[PDB]
């Protein structure tokens, strides 16, 4: 039948792709960086403990100034903090308390959030009356909102449990592009430094590179064994790292079109909830279900430090654009700044 | 100057802290419930008796606030979004007395999930009347789908309703002991299961939830003092 031919032909192309990737693998990253000096023990300390949310935290996002940040809690509240002083600036009540993601517009004028309501809500922080009111409600997803990131003040890319990603035109309420091809819930997305491309991780154990303007998947990366929960671009935009429920983080090269390194340990048995790079990319930070965060030497795959200050599972983390600090959120309802 | 900026930031923080204090009063004084269905269970009719992905229904029992949430427009794959409800007072699981076996696998997943281990489950074995007529007719049997029914006997702790024939009493009690086997196998004092033989229209449903929640909160209090 034609179904077998299409299934048979697809298997033929997968073998071809695997052969091409196998030909490019003449030397591993580990042996290329074998002669470089180790990073050494890096010890970080909790410099700030942000309190005030009533329930578990699900997402946080640094502002482009490296000082302000927004946090989303399932109590139905969005809080914008000033990390330097610990003072709270905005407490935005939410129509639905089941929020799962939040984003800080790069201009600092808007913040977004979504969740089980399947709606992406944008809030105008600079309203003429000083109060924070919902500006636009983006509907059209048939599943919960998992992640979102502003491209500019009028464009935002989202990921949904409906297995698709969408690009929206704010102030019209319509999505101008739909990124289909994932089979499981899309869990995280990351914008490239140039914003021309972005990568998404789904519950099908695969990550996809997308073309924002054209709207098609350019590459697909495999190697993880379970759901991908977090994804982050390498600083130069030629690689990215992912965290999975299989208790491992992996580094993928865009030009080599294959995996380069696996960060794992025998004592690490829980899933990874978040991932982020340092300013230079030498360090890879990952949050874990076991309440801890591990610092990895990206070049040598060695573990260099641990952040252990949370009493419940770490749900999100991020590194300031200046690279001066890293923030971690937990279901324990607290946010911590490490330096 | 800067001292004026810091003063303004403290006043802004102070005002927000005031609203959050009152916000914490309402949140702590309201019990959140997740309404879950195994399919055609009749929970919609029960809800009628008191893109949108979540539905809400608020009701009051003896001056006590209750907040119940029903999932809509969400895919059948629950392993991700189910984690959101790890802190609700209880999960209401409505089941129509091989959908029954399917409902059993979903209950076992919920009962044994690492995030949901401390969460209690109120179980509504719904549509007792429908099971009665089917049992009485005998055209369909539970033996085909559950061979252990042949060797099952009505429990000595059974309290059949007045006028209930022995055949229907065994059927509904056999189904109840299917869920109880899963619940007792695990959950070492962390969470509990409350079965109920219910009809989709009986007015006593909201009273049952109120009584089950009170026991759950009582047990939580006793466990914080290490008494139970």
């Amino acid at each position, epitope marked *: 039948s034609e179904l077998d031919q299409l*299934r048979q032909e697809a298997e033929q192309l*997968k073998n071809q792709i695997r052969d091409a990737r196998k030909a490019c693998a003449d030397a591993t990253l580990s042996q290329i960086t074998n002669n470089i000096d180790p990073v050494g023990r890096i010890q970080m300390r909790t410099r700030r403990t942000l309190r005030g949310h009533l329930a578990k935290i699900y997402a946080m996002h640094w502002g482009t100034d490296s000082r302000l940040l927004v946090s989303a809690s399932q109590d139905g509240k969005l809080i914008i903090w000033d990390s330097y002083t610990t003072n709270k600036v905005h407490a935005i009540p939410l129509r639905s308390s089941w929020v799962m993601t939040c984003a800080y517009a790069p201009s600092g004028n808007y913040v977004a959030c979504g969740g089980l309501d399947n709606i992406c809500s944008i809030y105008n922080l600079k309203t003429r009356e000083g109060n924070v009111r919902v500006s636009r409600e983006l509907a059209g997803h048939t599943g919960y909102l998992s992640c979102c990131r502003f491209l500019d003040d009028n464009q935002i890319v989202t990921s949904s449990g409906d*297995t698709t990603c969408a690009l929206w035109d704010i102030e019209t309420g319509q999505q101008t592009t739909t990124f289909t091809g994932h*089979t*499981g819930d899309v869990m995280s997305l990351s914008l490239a430094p140039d914003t021309r491309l972005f990568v998404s991780g789904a*519950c*099908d*154990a695969s990550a996809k590179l997308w073309d924002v303007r054209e709207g098609m998947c350019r590459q697909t990366f*495999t*190697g993880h*064994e*379970s*759901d991908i929960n977090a994804i982050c671009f390498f600083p130069n935009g030629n690689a990215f790292a992912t965290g999975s*429920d*299989d*208790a491992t983080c992996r580094l993928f090269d865009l030009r080599a079109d294959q995996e380069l390194m696996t960060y794992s340990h025998d004592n690490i*048995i829980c*899933g990874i909830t978040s991932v982020s790079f340092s300013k230079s990319g030498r360090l890879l930070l990952a949050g874990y279900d076991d309440f801890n965060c591990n610092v990895w030497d990206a070049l040598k795959a060695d573990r260099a430090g641990v952040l252990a200050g949370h009493d419940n599972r770490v749900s999100c983390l991020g590194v300031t654009d200046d690279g001066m600090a890293v923030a971690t959120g937990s279901w324990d309802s607290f946010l911590k700044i490490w330096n | 100057d800067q001292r004026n900026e810091e003063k303004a930031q403290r006043e802004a923080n102070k005002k927000i802290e005031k609203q959050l204090q009152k916000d914490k009063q309402v949140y702590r004084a309201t019990h959140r419930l997740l309404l879950l269905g195994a399919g055609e269970s009749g929970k919609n009719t029960i809800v009628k008796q008191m893109t949108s992905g979540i539905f809400e229904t608020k009701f009051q029992v003896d001056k006590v606030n209750f907040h119940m949430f029903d999932v809509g427009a969400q*895919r*059948d*794959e*629950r*392993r991700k979004w*189910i984690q959101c409800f790890n802190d609700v007072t209880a999960i209401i699981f409505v089941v129509a007395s*091989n959908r029954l*076996q*399917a409902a059993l*696998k979903l209950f*076992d*997943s*919920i009962w*044994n*999930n*690492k995030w949901l281990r401390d969460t209690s489950v109120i179980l509504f074995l719904n549509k007792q009347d429908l099971l009665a007529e089917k049992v009485l007719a005998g055209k369909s049997k539970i033996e*085909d*789908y*559950f*061979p*252990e029914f042949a060797r099952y006997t009505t429990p000595e702790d059974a309290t059949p309703e007045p006028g209930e024939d022995p055949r229907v009493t065994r059927a509904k009690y056999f189904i109840r002991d299917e869920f109880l086997r899963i619940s007792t196998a695990s959950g070492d004092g962390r969470h509990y299961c409350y079965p109920h033989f219910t009809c989709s229209v009986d007015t006593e449903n909201i009273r049952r939830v109120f009584n089950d929640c009170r026991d759950i909160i009582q047990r939580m209090h006793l466990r914080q003092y290490e008494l139970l």
Partner: nanobody, 128 residues
Framework: QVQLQESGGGLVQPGGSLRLSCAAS????????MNWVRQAPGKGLEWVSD????????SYTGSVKGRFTISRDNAKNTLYLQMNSLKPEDTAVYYC?????????????????????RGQGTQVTVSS
């Protein structure tokens, strides 16, 4: 790449038997729970059986409790289902399904209409 490829099955007379196999690759086979599911013509997906990581814990659906037998060989990354006394109601497509996460006690979504960690099932037809 996570891959599951079921083999075996086909036309069998009533009262016969079959031996289904599932070849797994792309993941550590020894730390995942496994399941067999089937989809009868004009019906939804139905759970059949499952086996723990070490094979100690086994369970079956009522209709096949004494007839089917599930086994696994961790060293070879293969899953088995021995089907005996097959009757016409058993005709369906049988899929080899892996639980979503390793080292886990629960097993969610294995019977959903679309599930990533499931192979392309093998047709099993019981007829005269």
């Amino acid at each position: 790449q996570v891959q599951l490829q079921e083999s075996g099955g086909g036309l069998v007379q009533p009262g016969g038997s079959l031996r289904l196999s599932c070849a797994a690759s792309g993941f550590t086979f020894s730390n995942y729970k496994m399941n067999w599911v089937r989809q009868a013509p004009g019906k939804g997906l139905e759970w059949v059986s499952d086996i723990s990581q070490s094979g100690a814990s086994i369970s079956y659906t009522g209709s096949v409790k004494g007839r089917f037998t599930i086994s696994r060989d961790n060293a070879k990354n293969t899953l088995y289902l021995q089907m005996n006394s097959l009757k016409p109601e058993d005709t369906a497509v049988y899929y080899c399904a892996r639980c979503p996460a390793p080292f886990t006690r629960d097993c969610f979504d294995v019977t959903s209409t679309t599930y990533a960690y499931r192979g392309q099932g093998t047709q099993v037809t019981v007829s005269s």
